[PDB]
Amino acid sequence: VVGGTEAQRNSWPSQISLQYRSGSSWAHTCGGTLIRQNWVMTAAHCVDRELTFRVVVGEHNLNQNNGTEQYVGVQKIVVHPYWNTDDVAAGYDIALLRLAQSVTLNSYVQLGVLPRAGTILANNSPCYITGWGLTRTNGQLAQTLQQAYLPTVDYAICSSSSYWGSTVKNSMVCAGGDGVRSGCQGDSGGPLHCLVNGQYAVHGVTSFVSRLGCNVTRKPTVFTRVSAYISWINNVIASN
Numbered sequence: 051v052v053g054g055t056e057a058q059r060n061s062w063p064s065q066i067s068l069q070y071r072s073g074s075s076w077a078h079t080c081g082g083t084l085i086r087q088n089w090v091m092t093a094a095h096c097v098d099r100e101l102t103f104r105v106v107v108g109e110h111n112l113n114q115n116n117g118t119e120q121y122v123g124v125q126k127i128v129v130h131p132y133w134n135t136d137d138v139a140a141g142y143d144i145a146l147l148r149l150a151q152s153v154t155l156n157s158y159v160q161l162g163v164l165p166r167a168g169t170i171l172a173n174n175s176p177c178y179i180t181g182w183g184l185t186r187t188n189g190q191l192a193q194t195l196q197q198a199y200l201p202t203v204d205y206a207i208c209s210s211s212s213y214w215g216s217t218v219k220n221s222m223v224c225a226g227g228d229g230v231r232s233g234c235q236g237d238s239g240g241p242l243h244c245l246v247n248g249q250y251a252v253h254g255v256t257s258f259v260s261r262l263g264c265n266v267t268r269k270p271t272v273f274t275r276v277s278a279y280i281s282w283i284n285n286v287i288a289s290n
């Protein structure tokens with residue numbers, strides 16, 4: 051996240067780090083949201099490569115032991131069946147990961163609250179993106195989890211010609227676009243937390259930013275709209 055601030059250690063306990071095995075170690079590649087003790091919601095584009103993945107819950111600093119982390123392998127990957135790698139703009143950028151073991155909940159590890167199905171936020175709704183993605187366009191990943199306030203940009207504005215045009219669909223949420231704050235590579239898959247009726251809920255799954263760069267004026271970060279996929283999510287969880 052570009053233009054973010056370090057999150058407090060226990061602010062976003064559903065945020066997970068999705069990592070892939072790289073030689074003798076592990077490398078962060080995307081975020082995700084813990085939605086069941088053994089299920090993670092992330093972006094389908096994060097699991098397009100045939101890599102070995104693990105999820106880290108209760109993570110704060112990627113390069114140091116925080117003494118709060120739980121490490122778990124990904125046992126099954128279910129990508130939305132309409133997802134197409136060649137077309138992120140078509141949408142369906144969502145996937146569910148069944149964890150090899152159920153994680154233990156505590157103040158650093160909690161399930162993400164999902165919105166009711168069909169919920170659409172009013173323009174300019176208050177949301178925060180969180181993640182360890184690049185802190186600058188063509189930069190490096192953050193060491194500590196970052197957060198940035200990114201107000202939503204409704205579909206009418208977001209899909210307008212000055213913004214994203216036809217690239218944005220109504221199955222997505224746009225947020226930000228101020229030219230200073232945004233998601234960036236490595237934040238994909240993570241949550242967009244929006245305050246609704248006093249409770250933060252995960253309304254988006256980070257999906258894409260402009261090819262021009264991360265923090266680009268009028269190119270708000272684009273997220274899969276979680277509330278469009280509630281029955282899909284429940285169907286997967288129930289049949290697996």
Ligand SMILES: *C(=O)[C@@H](CC)[C@@H](CNS(=O)(=O)c1ccc(C)cc1)C(=O)O
Nearest residue numbers: 079233234235236237238256257258259
């Ligand atoms: C997500 O991080 C997104 C910006 C918010 C990225 C794409 N996701 S990624 O950087 O994880 C990705 C890109 C390509 C591959 C092969 C793997 C990972 C974006 O550039 O829109």
Ligand SMILES: [Ca+2]
Nearest residue numbers: 111114115116
């Ligand atoms: Ca750590």
